[PDB]
């Protein structure tokens, strides 16, 4: 197996067990058993337990930010369509039980762990991405300026959190999209 082949297999499996058991709970030996490789092989690719954790979380952040940027579409895409894209993709990601989204949200509440500084720093770009989208909407009179764009971004973040919990409770696309459209309509008003 080529080295790029192998590294992505190990990262996949590490993300998988993180989603099932929690961030950073599985050892290199556990990853080795899932990949049917020696423990030394995993250490060759990730010299420390912490190096594997940060590289999995970097991939999780990239999945999150790529989802948002894809929803931004081309310039001039209406704020409403961007917001519906974000909520509908979040809902569908819960329905498919995507590992990265489960790990992202667990990362967000790992306050006391060495990984939380990575969460708050690495995800500034997504906060700024959402802030720019609301600021654009402000400029185009698609939403009022009663709240600063950054506060609207945080508000949307909280909506994504409750949608995430509600969709895990009830992974029904139609019912969940009705809830999400209600939140977005209220946010836009």
- Which residues lie near a second copy (CB under 8 A)? 19-25, 102, 105-106, 108-113, 116, 120, 146-147, 151, 154-155, 157-162, 164-166, 168-169, 179, 182-183, 186, 189
- Min dist CB 38 to a second copy, Å, is 27
- Min dist CB 120 to a second copy, Å, is 6
73 or 148, CB closer to a second copy? Answer: 148
- Min dist CB 15 to a second copy, Å, is 13
- Min dist CB 4 to a second copy, Å, is 29
- For residue 85, the tally of other CB atoms under 10 A from its CB is 17
Q: Which has the closest alpha carbon to 97: 18, 174, 167, 23?
A: 167
148: left (phi over 0), alpha (psi -120 to 50) or beta: beta
Q: What is the distance between the alpha carbons of residues 108 and 118, in angstroms, rounded to a whole number?
A: 10
- Min dist CB 113 to a second copy, Å, is 7
51 or 169, CB closer to a second copy? Answer: 169
69 or 170, CB closer to a second copy? Answer: 170
Q: Which has the closest alpha carbon to 160: 77, 62, 73, 83?
A: 83
- For residue 74, the tally of other CB atoms under 10 A from its CB is 5
Q: What is the distance between the alpha carbons of residues 59 and 65, in angstroms, rounded to a whole number?
A: 10
18 or 45, CB closer to a second copy? Answer: 18
Q: What is the distance between the alpha carbons of residues 153 and 80, in angstroms, rounded to a whole number?
A: 14
- What is the chain's percent helix, strand, coil content, to nearest 5? 75, 0, 25
38 or 185, CB closer to a second copy? Answer: 185
């Amino acid at each position: 197996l080529s080295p790029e082949k192998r590294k992505q297999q190990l990262l996949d499996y590490a993300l998988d067990v993180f989603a099932r058991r929690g961030i950073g709970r599985a050892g290199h030996a556990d990853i080795a058993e899932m990949a049917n490789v020696s423990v030394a092989t995993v250490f060759n690719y990730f010299p420390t337990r912490e190096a594997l954790v940060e590289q999995v979380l970097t991939q999780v952040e990239n999945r999150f930010s790529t989802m948002l940027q894809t929803c931004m579409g081309n310039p001039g895409k209406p704020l409403l369509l961007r917001l519906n894209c974000i909520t509908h993709n979040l809902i569908d990601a819960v329905i498919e039980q995507q590992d990265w989204l489960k790990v992202w949200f667990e990362w967000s509440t790992s306050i006391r762990d060495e990984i939380w500084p990575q969460f708050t720093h690495d995800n500034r770009k997504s906060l700024e991405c959402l802030t720019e989208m609301f600021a654009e909407g402000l400029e185009k009179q698609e939403i009022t300026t009663q709240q600063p764009a950054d506060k609207l971004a945080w508000q949307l973040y909280g909506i994504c959190y409750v949608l995430y919990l509600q969709a895990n409770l009830n992974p029904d696309q139609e019912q969940m999209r009705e809830l999400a459209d209600g939140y977005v309509t209220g946010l836009l008003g």
